[PDB]
Structures are given as C-alpha cells and as structure tokens.
Ligand binder design. Structure first.
Ligand code: ICS
Ligand code: CLF
Ligand code: CLF
Ligand SMILES: [Mg+2]
Ligand SMILES: [Mg+2]
Lengths: 477, 522, 522, 477
C-alpha cells in the first residue's frame, strides 16, 4: 500500500545527511495513476548529489554514444584526451550493415588524443590536420562529426571555425558538437545538443532539392538506435503495413537518410526523450507531424500499428490487419510457451529515458507485474507518461543511488530486475535474476513481434535458470 | 517471422529472405551507398604497402587506440585497499565509464563515485563538490578510506585536491582523522597505468611521509610487493602462492583479488579484502620493496627508494622462464630463504612442456600489443620458445622502454625480424599484419576487428587473435588466468600451441582436399 | 619445389600445381577410382535417416569404437604405485601400444614390460616366460614391486598367474618377500576401465587379505580414495587439495600424478611418487573408503565392503555442483571435519560464474561420449547449466548404468530430448549428429573425423568438437586440466561458454554479411 | 676406439642376470666397416628377452599397421578383441587422398570386438555377418582384409573359409591374414605374412587380363608407406625422370594398383625389410627385376636416380640429369643455410627395419655424424648394408632395451637422438634434442629433394632450439 512505500522511502533516506535527505525525498515517490501532473509526486532532471554513485553518464554519452555514433557513413571524432572514446568504443549495440573501415565506421574509435601540448596551446591546429588525415585514409566517409570532450570548452577552442573552414575545403559536411561532459546533468542535454547540431549543420541540406520521388506513405523512424536490430524488426512491420520507411535515426542510419527526412509525411518517434527536439523542429519548419509509438510486446505493437495506420487511408488500415493476423499465431505460441512460466513474477526496472515505461506492456503480456521503475535522466514529461502505465502505489525513483536501489530491492524482494551493467553483478550475488535493459544482455532484438519471442525466451531462461536454486551451500542451512 | 520451437536472435534472424530483401531496399532506396565495386577497390587499397606509408605519416589522428585514461588505473589501484572507496574528482560521466569498462572485463560489480562537477565548477572551481561529495560518500557507503583521483576537467581548471580535502576537514564535511589520500591523474598525460602509479604513490605518501622517524628497514622481516595495473586474478594469486611456498613474509600493496571475485552466496559485498591501512604504515619497515611492473611504477619507485630508503631491485616483470628465475633468486637473496623443491619442480615442468611443444611453436610469427611491462614480458617469453615476435606495439610506450626491448631482441636470433612501435594504434597494426603477415595476433578484444578485416581479404590472409591482455569483453572468465611465473608461462604456452593446432586442424579439415594432413596425433 | 626462406611441410607443399597434377594422373591412371558424383551420392546417403536405420541394426561390425582393452587400465593403475613396474604377461606387441597410447596423451615416458610370449607358449604355456621375465625385470629396472596383467593370448591359453608367480618364487627367480600382485585382465571382457578395477583389487588383495586379523576400521583416522582410470592430472591434485584444505587425513590409492609429470632437469626418473606399499597395508584401518568412479570400481567395492568391512558411501563422481557438494558433505560426516570457508567461497565463485554465463549456455545441445562415470558427471553438470545433452553415448556402459542416467535426465527439464546409447560407437554417433544435429560434441580426439564429416556436408551442418576425455592426441597439455570438484567445474564452464562464443565469432565474422552481430561485448 | 666401445658395452651389460647377459652381448657390437658378414659382430631377429622393455611390436603391427592398413580403397578388419585396432587407429602417418568413410577408410577402425561369447564359441559366424554389414554400409569399398589378432589362431577359427565363401557371395576380394601377435618375434614376420597374403589372394587377379596399356617406362614404388607424403615427393621425381609409376605399395596405394604391378618393367624397392619377399616373388613368376633405392638427402637421391635411369635407355638418363640440375640450387641453398648450424654434431638412431641405415646419408650431407644406430626387428642382411654406411668403431645395437639405450646415451653424450615415441620423452628430460624417425615428429615429408629441405629445417629447429639451454635452474648449479 501507499504508506508501506512511504515509510520504506523514509527508512532508506535515513542514511543521508540533512541536505542530501531533502534532495532525495523529492526524487522518490509511490505511483499515483489518477494524477495528471508528475511534479506533485516526483522531481527529475536535476543535478546529481556528489558522491552517491549515480548510474548517470554525461552529455558526450548522449551525443556521441547515443545520437551520432550510430550513423554509419559518418566518421565521429572523440575530440579530447584518449579515454571517453575508448570506453564508448563498441559499447553500445547500435547495429548496422556496412564494410567497417571503408564505408561505415560505427565500431571504430577516432580521437585526437590530447597531450599536455594540446591543453596548453589548444587543439584547433591538431583538429585541422586530423580532418585532413581522415580525408586521406578514409576517402569513402560521407561526413564528420566532432564530439567535444570536457577540455574543449574549458580551453576555449573554436571547433565551429575549423569545421566550417575544413567543410568548405574538402566539400564535406563537418558537424561540431558541444557535448562536453560538464554541460547539463545527464545524457539528456547531450541529446538536445546533438539534436540541435543536426538541425544546424545537416538537416537543411536539401531544402532547395525536390528531385527525390515522394509518396503519401513515406515515414521516418525517429529515436530507434537499433539495439540488437530493434529498428529492423520495427521497420519490417511498417513496410509490410504498406508504408515506406525513408529514414532511420540513427540505428543503421546514414546522412542521406537524415537529409531526406524533411520529405516524409509522418515522423514515427520511438524515443521521445532523445529525439522529440528535432521532431518538433521538423513540425515547425517542414510541417511534418509526429507521433509516439511503442513496439514492445503484442499489446503495444498492435495498438501502435493501428494508431499509425489510422493516420493514412483505409488501404493501410487493411494491410495493418493482415499484418496483425499474420503474426497472431506466432506471438500466441510465445504466450503459450512462456506466460505459464512467468505468471505472477514481479519486476523492478531502472533504465535511462524511455524503457522504464515502454517495456511494461511486454511484461504484462507474459503475466508479469512491474512493481518498481525509475529513470536516470528522464524529465517530468516522462513521468507523466509513466503514471498510467505503472500500477497503483508502485515504486518510482529518479536518479536512484547505489544505496537506494539495493535497499529498495531487499524489502520489495522482486523475482527479476532490469537495469544496466553496473547494477548487474550486484543483484546476481544477492540471488536475484537480472536482465540488462540497455544491451539486451547481448541478445535481441526485443521490438516488434519477432523481438517479443526473444524477449520472452530471455526472461524465462534467466528467471527460471537452475543457477538461482544453488546460491546457498547445502551445509550452511 | 519466428518458429517458437527454435527462436532466432539477431543472428541468424536477419538472414531470412524477408529481412535481406528489406535491407536491400533500404540500401538502394535511401542510403546512397557507394557501389560494392568502389568499396572493394578501397578495401583492397587499405591492405597495400602504399596505404601503410600514408597511415604511418599520421600526426594528429589516432584510430583505434590501445590505451586508456589515468583515472582508470587510479580506480583499480584504490580497489586494492581495505574498505576503500575510489572517488574521482570531476565529471560523473567518467565514473560511469570506468565502472562499465571493468564490469565487462571482470563480470563483477565495481564500486566508484564522482563529485558530479558541472558548468558552475568551470567558473568557481570544484570546492563545494569535494566537500559535499566526501561527506555524502562516507555517510552513504561507510568506507574506511576514500582515495581521490581527478578527471581532465578538474585538472584543466586547476583544482587543488590538497587544499580542497583539508577545507572539507576544516569545515566539518569529513572527520580530520578520516584517511583521504589523493593524487593528480590527468587523462591528457600517460595512460591508465600512469594513473595507477600516481594513485599508489599518493596512498603510500599519505601513510608514511610524516611518520618516518621511527621507521627501520628490515624490522618487519617482510618484502613489499607492488603489482601495478593487473587485470588477471591469477597474477595476484600466483605471486602470493610462490612467496608462501618459499616461506617468505610479504606485504601485497594494492591487492584487489578478493573484491573482484566475491562469491555469489546471497550477499552483496561492496568491499572485500584489500591491503590494510596498517600494512601501508608498516611498509617502510620491510626488508625491501619489489615492483612487478617497473615500467609503469617510476614515480612509486622514486618515492620508495627516496623516502623509505629501500634498495628497489632492478627486476623485469616475472614473466617466462628467465625472469621468473631472476625474480625468485632476488627474493631468496633479500629474504634469506632458499628456493624450495616444489618451485624447482614447477620450473622443471614448464621446461618439460617447452621440450614437448617446441616443434609447433618454432618460427611462428606474432603481432602483439598491450601495456609496456606485459608486452616486453610476452616478447621475452616468445623468444625463449623459439617464436618470432614480428610486430611489437605499445601505444603507451616510450623510447627508453623501446630501447630496453630492442636490447632483448638483439640478444636473441629470434628477434632479427622484430620491430617495436610506440605511440601507434591498432589501425597502424592493421596495416602491418596485411603487408607483413604474421601467423597470429596476441592482444585484447579490440583485435577481433583486425581479424575480421584480414578474413575479408581472404581465408589465407586471416590472422587469428589470441586473447591475452586487457580488456577482454567477448570471452568469459579469462580474467581468472595467470600470466606471471611458471604457472602463467604454462597457461600461455598451452594457449599458443593449441591455437596453432586449432588453426592447423581448420586448414586441414577440407575433405579430399587438405585432410591428407588432418592427423589424429600432433 | 622449395623456396629455402619459407620451406613447406606436407601441408601446404602438396597443394602446388606440380603435385596436384601428379595425383590427378595417379588417380585417373591406376586407382580406378569411383566417379566423384558417385562418391558425393554415397556421402549424401550416409547422412540420411535411412542410413542411420541400417547403421543401428548392426550386430557384428564395430566401427570407430570408444573403448580399449582391460590391460591398458591395469597398466595405468599399477603406475600409481611407488617404484612399481607394470608388467604384462603375454605378447610384447600389446605393451608397445599401451606405452605409445599413453605417451601421446601425457607426452611423458610410460614404463611397462612384457614377458614376450611366442608360438611355443601356445603349446607349452607361459611358465618359463614369467620366471625369466620377473627375474630380468627386477634385475634391470630395480622396481620395489611388479604388478602383473594379462594379454588376451595368455587368457585364452588359460595360464595361471598365481601358480606361475609362486613357482618363480619357489624356484628362486625372485625373492619370496618380493611383492608381485596380479590380476586377470581379459581384453575380451569389458574395457580399459575393467582392467583398472581388476588390477586395483588385485593389488589390494595382495597386501591385506591374509593380514586382516590385526586390522581395525578407524585406527588410521583417514579416508581411502580410489580414483579409478584417470587421465587428467588435475583430478588427482584437486582431490588432494580439497582434502588437505578440509584438514582430512587421506590415502590416495593408485596415485600416478608424479610419474606422469616428472620435471625436465637432466635426469630420467623412471619411477616417482606413488601410493606406498605401507599405505596399502594400512588401508583397511581407514575410517572408510570412497570411490571416485563407482561405475567401473564394482569389483573393488565388493572387496572393500567384503574384506575391509568399510561402509563404502553411495556417491557419484564429484563432478559439477551437486555431486561435489554431496562428496564434500560425506567426507565431513565420515571425517568429523567441517567444510572450511575457503571451499565455501570456491563453491560461491563457481555459482558466480554460472550466473555470469547462463545466457550463452542456456539451451545448447550437446553430443558426448566417454567412460560411464565421466559421461554421467558431464551430463549432470550440463543439466545444472541449463544445457540439453541430446546424444549420450557410452560404448562400455551397461543397462544398470543407463537406467541411472535415465533417472537423472528424468529429474531435470533439460533431459527431455536426451537419449542414452550403450554398446554403440562413433560411427553410430556420426549418424545421430547428422539426423539430430547438436550444437557441439564433447569427447576425445577421435571426434575430429566426425567434425570433418559434418563440415563436408556444409558449414551450417558442422558440429565442433570440444575435447574433454581420453585420449587427446591433437592438442598439447590438456592432460593437465581438472574435471573434478569446483575447480574442474570452472574449467569446463569456461571451455563450454568460450567454445560457444568462439564459434559465434566465426559465424559473425563475415563482413557486411553476418558481422552486424560481431559484438565487442559478449 | 674399439676397446673403449667394447668395455662400454660390458659396463652396461653388468646389470643383467647371467642368462640375459649372454644374450645381449651378441646383440651389441662396435661397427667394423671392413667386414663383409654381420653375423661375426652382431645377432638379430631373435626372441626378445622377457621383461627388458623392448621397443618391439607384433606381427599384427607389421601386417595391419604397416603393409595393409595404408591401402585406401580396401576395408581392413581388426579381427579379435577391441584394443589392437584402437591403439593402431591413425597412429601411423601413411598419407592418402580420399573421401574417408565413403571410398577410402585408412584412418577408421573396423573391428569384430570379441567378447567371451566369441572366444568360447569362435567368431566365424560373427565375421560372416560382419562382412555383410560392411557391404551394406560401405558399398564403395573395393575389398576387405581380415587382420588376425592373437585369439584367432588360438581358438582355431577358419577365416580362410569365410573369406572364400563371402568373397564369392559379394564378388569382392576378401583377404585373410594370419598376423596374430604371438607369431614371430617382431613386426618383421608380420610383413612376410602380409606379403604372402597379397601373393595368395590379390596379385594374380589380372594374370589373364592384358587389356592394360603398358610402356617401356612403367615401374612400381614398393615399400614406401608415404609417411607425411614421402611417396609423393618420391614419385614426382620419378615422373619428372620420364617414368610411369603404375603402383605405390602401400602409401596412398589401392587394390587396382597392386593388381597392376605384375605388368610393370621394374620394381623400385624403398623398404627392403618389409617388401623384398613379394619383390622376389614377382621376379620368379612374372620375370620383373627389382632394385633397392634411397631418397634420403641429395647424395643418395642422386645416386639412386642415376642408378635407376641406367636401367633404361638414354632418354631416361637425360631426363635424370635435367631433374638433378633442376633441384641442385634448391638443395644447395638448404646446405648453405643449415650445414653451418649442424656441422660436427653427433647423432644416435634407433628405428625399425630400414631407416637406421638409410637416413645416414642425409645427416652426412648436413655435416653431421651418426655415432650410434640400431634396429628393432632388422635382420643380418640389414646389418650387412649398415656396415659400410656407419663410421669405424661406432655403436650397433639390435633390439636395444630401455636400460641399454639410456646408459649408452649417457656415455656417448650425443647432440641428437632419432627414435620412436616411447623413447622420445625419456631423452628430452635428460636434455638431449630428440627427433622422431617414425612419424617425423608430425612433420615431413623427408624423402626426395623437397623432403631434404624439411629434414634439414627440422633437425636445426630441434638441435639448436632455445629450450635446451634452460634445463638446469640457475640456482641449482
Ligand atoms: S615399413 Fe617398417 S619401425 Fe620399412 S615396420 Fe616400421 S614406415 Fe620404421 S624404420 Mo616405424 S622397416 Fe617403414 C618402418 Fe622402417 S612403421 Fe615405419 S618408421 S621403413
Ligand atoms: S564527463 Fe564525459 S566521459 Fe568524462 S572526460 Fe568528460 S566527456 Fe569524457 Fe574522458 S579522458 Fe578520462 S573519461 Fe574523463 S578524465 Fe577525461
Ligand atoms: S600382440 Fe599384437 S596388439 Fe597384442 S592382442 Fe596380440 S595382435 Fe593385438 Fe590386442 S586386444 Fe589387448 S592389445 Fe593385446 S590384450 Fe588383445
Ligand atoms: Mg563474475
Ligand atoms: Mg612431457
């Protein structure tokens, strides 16, 4: 009940000093599904408390790691000391098809590798030379981005000047991005900066070019970074529904596709958090509407498909029903095999800016119950959409600490937890089945009808694995 | 589409015709992709001696580095201390990565915290962060110690850790007695290994510098062991094992083997084992101090020789036969303890394995990279085996170190075709293995893209990766191995020979084609 | 032709055009070879469910067995005894092979002798041989003991070892006190493992039967350990390690770990270590006796329970988690010693590794063969991991053992698709892996031809061999591994997961084809 | 000196009882190159002393392992208990080209696998049924051999009757061989039996079939079992010399080739020990001469080539000199690279029935010196050919024991030993470089000009390997 949660929070909150206790009580709340405005319950997108072991990353992760890095045919420079780039190198499973090293570069790490020289004297000259070296050694690149690491702004380098100048010299799109770790409070501003960089440096390239053949069925997938091929298992359904997916952002994405996106009729936005900014921009300038969708589990995949089809004629609406009918026996078999094995089990989630609400439907479709969810860098308009998704008096936590997440789990005693790599091996030692909800535990995809099968299999394999029954020695009883 | 009795993941899901057809249409429709023949043309080009000449003329661009930041090594160092919380002054994005990086290599939790410095700290400096951080950290996680590192941001704005820590004490954010050693760890200098060195010397100075009057070399009748940046759990354990076996008193300083290998028993242990505070304070009283990785422990050495007045021996990493021998004999000298029969036998078994495997190892050509000490150890051992280390690369090496390696190569006939490369990266290496093809690569998981590339040119050009180094993310539990001592020598020897035989099987597996040579007995 | 700077061996020498052309002309000229089309037709046929039905109706013909003679196991047993010379009564051809077989597996000398019986012995029996043999053997090699086995020849002639040994003593060919235990080891019954059992019981009866009056169970405060036919040195060592760690007094009976791992120091040590004669004589005084491989120690058990009156516990091989647990708990009960924290932690680390690797192991299908105990141990462990053992084959198994394995499969959801085969051979298995394709095979080096065969049909049909068992001839030093206890569990788990990931890399290595899934992080 | 060797022998011989000491003094001798008859110095092909750890095998090894097993298109049954076949399975590197399991069977193990039933009641009925099962499951086999293990003769089975009866039923050559382990004293009789089996059951098959097209240049390689492809590197030279190698016995050999051998003009015998018997037979019946050759090292390969060419017209003799000239710069380079590294070094050999004398020339060509040699099962006509090959007062040992071979080595202190797998790991522990001279240390081939390169490389790699200078710990000095 509500008061059982309200004093759980107070128990956990006792550990903190006076100043810290006040901050965290605002970021911890029971869910109230009848509420309209989430600011009454919880606060979000505020500074992290120093030294509380937040799970959050920086703006560079939001820009380079999330938005830009996935674009295949562009080369993305980690501009600064060797480090940020190394840890982000192929860390994220944003899948793509290409000849890596030749026409695509996603899983490579290009960096300026700052020494003292370059901090003292600035790295504008180094950046210039670096771009020339790329053009020589990587002739098939179709563009370059410059991802600013912390020092760049602090030493006052003008990467905008270099980008413009070298852009006109080589006749290539070179995008400067001010995604320095210290800006903002999380990945979230990194997205916003990255989005704004696309607007300012890329999106307007074909404003005066209507040579591309259009149809009234053209769309773009916006904010699907194709983890384990999620975008592909999404796309296939849209093209089977009789639509034309002109662009994907940015999973398996390309620059030509970004440039073509202002020509589509509808923007289909998976991740609101990361890509609502540019979606709004295209509605303003180019007049393109956009709608949020959700391809997690049959219930939402179906809802979404129909909601999209309804934006077109009755031909799409028909094709939509053929599609749903084609996959009904596939997902029904999945529910037959696995729902029995998962019915009643209880889950606690903690992910970034979307998946804490999106994946709920998928769990509910295997008879599971999400009892705890939280976002790392989510805003109050993310909590607005989580309200009706979560059960009554379930547990909400923004920017949860290591301490808080552990303490909560011990009282709630969930059958399963869904979170990231840093939280993974903690909860596996406590004997609690764990699934990664970023990397998919190196599995996937989990989107669409084809993904739901995999999702179900994966939850079952982990939740009912024989390893969990063996944690305690027979003698220590 | 999915059949439920045999569900497909990304692979081989996307090999279905429906998906293949979709991606063809995506490509042709909207990707404006270069033609396949242009791509093949350029790919062929990147394998040429011409492309290599351009590649090696690079001056600004680094591609596919084989190194990390200082703070990374600082964290790993700090984790070797009892109930110590690694704490890094600067941006929280760094710690997110540090933890992940280690998470993926060790498949263990990794504890570390940040000040969460933001834009405000660029103008006003990070004093307030340090204060609130130190306070919150201590309150929330109950460490007995907090070891402070820096991110580049803090270094550039020029924050003074010493002053900042003291003012936190002065203003009652942390108790005065509470131990908060620190070190400056600029990511724009050296590498992860330099961070380990700076942190470690930061910790050793905190517990000893002021209290050196009562100290007397030899009083504790033990040997200090500084291990350096080590990511193989077998390496901490083998040294401990060999010293116990010798009956030598030792003190392992920065010992994280316990905290990176807690059991799964139903408890989460945030802290576990570690070098004690008293072990550090008593360290000056040791007979002597031995550095396992001398080439990244330059600052530590200056302090130990300088302040503790220990004659630090001139010892190479104890890898392979000769350098394990020399290591054991030094300890015998320092400790007074003879080398026992059990270690003389272990040695004898390694030599037996060398005699048993020499025919397959002889003349095999290798490319290898990693941190300086590791790399030179590997080189040495390969030469003991009769292998040819053709391409030796150390991104975080220097001319002094290079010269030391060139000396070793010159002392062996197997080093005639070797070449050492410092400040170069895996994109440089990629070239080398195309133009001057070895049999194998030895190195970390980042070498899989090179293997991918070499296969693309053709099967007869494929250079297989043997995973020894750090990080290793695409295999499980190799972090449990040993590379040091005779045990580590035996594991490596086995990996090398069986990698040769595995590949030879693969080449001879073609029926009525190459299987004339698919021998049962190798 | 040869270039001197890069000399070629058989492979790839004979891929030169001159040689290829020569062999084409040889084939067409004189070999009268079936047409390639006919060959491909028959090959295709041998992979079908039709061919399998015929294959499994075999009654006389055995093809590619997975077993050996009794005397082999006898030799290995005897080698576990101090300064003991295995000696085999019969034809010298047998010993030549026994030595070679072990030579190739252990890459060590293997000492064994024959009495070199010939045609004359068919008529007159092998009395004179035994006399001169025993004498010569003792004189030449100075054994402290000689353990006598039989070749099939001697068994068929019906020679009486007992009488023959005694007459050698009676006629002064050897001293009366000189110990010459013996056992009948007919190759036409059971397998190598039956030979181990017969020899061991032969040795235990020699030193105890007549001297049982003064014996009292428990006097020793120790546990006897009979290991059975074991070819992993880690298995002898791990048990010793775990018992020491528990503070349990133990007696390892037949312990050859020293003689199959002598150092290379300049001496040839024909003999080294071993169970002492006194250890055997004192064995009856032990608290109890534990058999590590009960399913091939049936005769030993009857003698221990029967003559020594030891309540032999009903324990499975200590492989995997549950059976290592059960083993350790039994010892705790028998010995009075608690299970110490170090082993509770080791256990916890194995479970940690299971949690870390479960996603990749889950649902993997395996075919496996070997000796009964090993095989069922493996099966059990696979089930603990969430793997599916689809094809379980034991050429030298029996209906009672099969029933015991069927019980284990029935108790687990992962045994739903499992099937157990006794008295079948690797040619039977070959069929099974074509018709009901697993992901991997687990077994000895003989499984490489099956892999060869499956590849020939196509890459998507290839079943990779993971080498665990005996013999292993085409890899080096895998005889040093462990399969027993938590240590053995951890080595296997690592081998299995990394075999899955190695193959997944191989499948995803195709550029712009399958490399979408060539992830850095697994 | 002769007397320094004569008392070395007596020192080693001290260990033996009176009866054994007398036997072994006959089987140990210094070499006298001026002697014509080897019976004056040494005795051979006698019974082994019981319990002295001879290196010798049995007649089954000689028959199945050496002669018959190499024939690819035949199926060879190991008839008896399971073991003999299992230990011989792919133990010997007799190389061949085929689809194993379909048209060739060399590396497989077919066996009757006798139980008690079959000892008591005999296995004649089992053998019959077994042959029927082969014909069903292995239709492309071109013939069957039955290799008798010890029990077969002892239980009085009539495999000749079964072979004849099933031979006429299936219309296949089925060859019974009485190679029972207990017959003879060594592999040697196994060869003789195997040879005689070929005569009696195979060789006469085309006596009234002259359809095969012949030339004046047809030959057979006799007694080369193609270890590591030795026969192939031999053959290529003969076909480059303008000869036609109609048959190989039995390395990569076939039944058709054995049947065709009576049509050739000359039999070229590599291994006299194993195959002189059948060579003599073909000289009697078919009138075909035969000569011994030797393709170990340039010196002998050249001598042999010319000696063979001289048996034909001047066309062959010319082609011979072309060949010699072609390979002169190749072997000259080999001697250039390796002789420096091997000059002066001293060798001790111990192999079966041929290679103890044959390989000497190859060593001498790299400036090495064989100081000790011995045969396992060699006869006195093998020692007759070793006399002039070996140096004066070098060490000869027939059927050497484990003790003897070790003790000898300690006094002689050779730089290298060449022997078998059972002796290998002994001498590697003493710190003495070792090469296998049966399996070639899983290398080869070593015959011909192409083999000599490999031979040289292999001796160098082992003799001067860095492992050998490391055996003693620095401290234990
Ligand atoms: S057949 Fe003989 S023992 Fe002449 S049984 Fe033996 S493959 Fe030896 S010295 Mo092994 S008479 Fe061949 C032989 Fe020489 S098996 Fe090989 S190497 S040249
Ligand atoms: S918050 Fe983010 S990850 Fe941090 S630096 Fe800043 S952009 Fe980058 Fe980089 S090199 Fe290392 S990890 Fe840092 S100290 Fe600099
Ligand atoms: S001398 Fe030779 S190998 Fe020996 S048996 Fe005889 S033919 Fe054969 Fe065979 S199965 Fe075992 S290994 Fe022997 S006891 Fe019988
Ligand atoms: Mg782990
Ligand atoms: Mg050995």
């Amino acid at each position: 009940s509500r008061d059982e949660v309200e004093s759980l929070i107070q128990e956990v909150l006792e550990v903190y000093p006076e100043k810290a206790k006040k901050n965290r009580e605002k970021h911890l709340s029971p869910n109230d599904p009848e509420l309209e405005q989430s600011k009454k319950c919880i606060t979000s997108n505020k500074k992290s408390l120093p030294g509380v072991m937040t799970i959050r990353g920086c703006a560079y992760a939001g820009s380079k790691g999330v938005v830009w890095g996935p674009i295949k045919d562009m080369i993305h420079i980690s501009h600064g000391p060797v480090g940020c780039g190394q840890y982000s190198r192929a860390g994220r499973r944003n899948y793509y098809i290409g000849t890596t090293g030749v026409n695509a570069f996603v899983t490579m790490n290009f960096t300026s590798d700052f020494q003292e020289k370059d901090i003292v004297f600035g790295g504008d000259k180094k950046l210039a030379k670096l771009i020339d070296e790329i053009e020589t050694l990587f002739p098939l690149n179709k563009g370059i981005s410059v991802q600013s690491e912390c020092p760049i702004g602090l030493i006052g380098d003008d990467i905008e000047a270099v980008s413009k100048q070298k852009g006109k010299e080589h006749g290539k799109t070179i995008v400067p991005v001010r995604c320095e770790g210290f800006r903002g409070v999380s990945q979230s501003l990194g997205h916003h900066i990255a989005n704004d960089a696309v607007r300012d440096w890329v999106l307007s390239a074909r404003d005066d070019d209507d040579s591309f053949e259009t149809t009234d069925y053209d769309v773009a997938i916006i904010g699907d970074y194709n983890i384990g091929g999620d975008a592909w298992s999404s796309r296939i359904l849209l093209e089977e529904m009789g639509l034309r997916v002109v662009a994907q952002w940015s999973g398996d994405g390309t620059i030509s596709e970004m440039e073509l996106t202002p020509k589509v009729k509808l923007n289909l936005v998976h991740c609101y958090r990361s890509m609502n900014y540019i979606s709004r921009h295209m509605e303003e300038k180019y007049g393109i509407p956009w709608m949020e969708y959700n391809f997690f589990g049959p219930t939402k995949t179906i809802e979404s498909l129909r909601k999209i089809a309804a934006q077109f004629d009755e031909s799409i609406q028909k094709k939509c029903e053929e599609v749903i009918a084609k996959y009904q026996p596939e997902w029904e078999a999945v529910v037959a095999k696995y729902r029995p094995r998962l019915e009643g089990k209880r889950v606690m989630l903690y992910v970034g800016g979307l998946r804490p609400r999106h994946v709920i439907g998928a769990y509910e479709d295997l008879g599971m119950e999400v009892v705890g969810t939280g976002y790392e860098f989510g805003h109050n308009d993310d909590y607005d959409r989580t309200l009706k998704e979560m059960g009554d008096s379930t547990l909400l936590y923004d920017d949860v600490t290591g301490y808080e997440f552990e303490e909560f789990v011990k009282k709630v005693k969930p059958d399963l937890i869904g979170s990231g790599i840093k939280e993974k091996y903690i909860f596996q030692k406590m004997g609690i089945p764990f699934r990664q909800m970023h990397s998919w535990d190196y599995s996937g995809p989990y989107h669409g009808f084809d993904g739901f099968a995999i999702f179900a299999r994966d939850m079952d394999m982990t939740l009912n694995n024989p390893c969990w029954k063996k944690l305690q020695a027979p003698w220590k009883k | 589409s999915q059949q439920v009795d045999k569900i497909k993941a990304s692979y081989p899901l996307f090999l279905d015709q429906d998906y293949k057809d979709m991606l063809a249409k995506k490509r042709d429709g909207f990707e404006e992709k270069y033609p396949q023949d242009k791509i093949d043309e350029v790919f062929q080009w990147t394998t040429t001696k011409e492309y290599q000449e351009l590649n090696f003329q690079r001056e600004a661009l680094t591609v596919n580095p084989a190194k990390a930041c200082q703070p990374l090594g600082a964290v790993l160092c700090a984790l070797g201390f009892e109930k110590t919380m690694p704490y890094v002054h600067g941006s929280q994005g760094c710690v997110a990565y540090f933890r992940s990086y280690f998470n993926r290599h060790f498949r263990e939790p990794v504890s570390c915290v940040s000040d969460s410095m933001t834009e405000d700290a660029a103008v006003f400096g990070g004093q307030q962060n340090m204060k609130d951080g130190l306070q919150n950290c201590k309150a929330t996680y109950k460490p007995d110690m907090i070891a402070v590192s820096t991110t580049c941001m803090a270094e550039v704005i020029g924050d003074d850790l010493n002053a900042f820590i003291n003012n936190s004490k002065k203003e009652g954010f942390i108790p005065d007695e509470f131990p908060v050693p620190f070190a400056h760890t600029p990511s724009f200098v050296g590498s992860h290994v330099t961070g380990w060195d700076n942190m470690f010397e930061g910790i050793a100075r905190y517990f000893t510098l002021k209290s050196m009057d009562d100290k007397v070399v030899g009083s504790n009748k033990k040997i200090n062991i500084v291990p350096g940046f080590e990511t193989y759990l077998g390496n901490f354990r083998v040294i401990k094992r060999m010293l116990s076996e010798m009956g030598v008193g030792y003190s392992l300083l920065s010992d994280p083997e316990e905290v990176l290998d807690t059991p799964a028993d139903g408890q989460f242990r945030m802290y576990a084992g570690g070098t004690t505070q008293e072990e550090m304070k008593d360290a000056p009283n040791a007979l002597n101090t031995v550095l396992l990785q001398p080439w990244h422990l330059e600052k530590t050495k200056k302090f130990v020789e300088g302040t503790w007045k220990h004659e630090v021996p001139k010892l190479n990493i104890p890898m392979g036969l000769d350098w394990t021998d020399e290591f054991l004999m030094k300890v015998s000298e320092i400790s007074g303890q003879p080398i026992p029969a059990s270690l003389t036998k272990e040695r004898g078994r390694l030599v037996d394995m060398m005699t048993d495997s020499h025919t397959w190892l002889h003349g095999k050509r290798f490319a290898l990279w990693g941190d300086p000490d590791f790399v030179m150890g590997l080189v040495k051992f390969l030469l003991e085996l009769g292998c040819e280390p053709v391409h030796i690369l150390c991104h975080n090496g220097n001319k002094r170190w290079k010269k030391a390696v060139d000396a070793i190569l010159a002392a062996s006939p197997y080093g005639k075709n070797a070449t050492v490369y410092i400040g170069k990266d895996l994109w440089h290496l990629r070239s080398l293995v195309f133009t001057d093809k070895p049999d194998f690569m030895i190195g970390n998981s980042y070498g899989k893209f090179i293997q991918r590339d070499t296969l693309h040119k053709g099967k007869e050009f494929e250079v297989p990766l043997i995973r020894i180094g750090f990080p290793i993310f695409d295999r499980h539990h190799l972090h449990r191995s040993t590379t040091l001592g005779y045990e580590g020598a035996m594991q490596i020897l086995t990996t090398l020979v069986n990698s040769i035989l595995e590949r030879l099987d693969e080449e001879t597996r073609g029926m009525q084609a190459t299987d004339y040579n698919h021998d049962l007995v190798r």
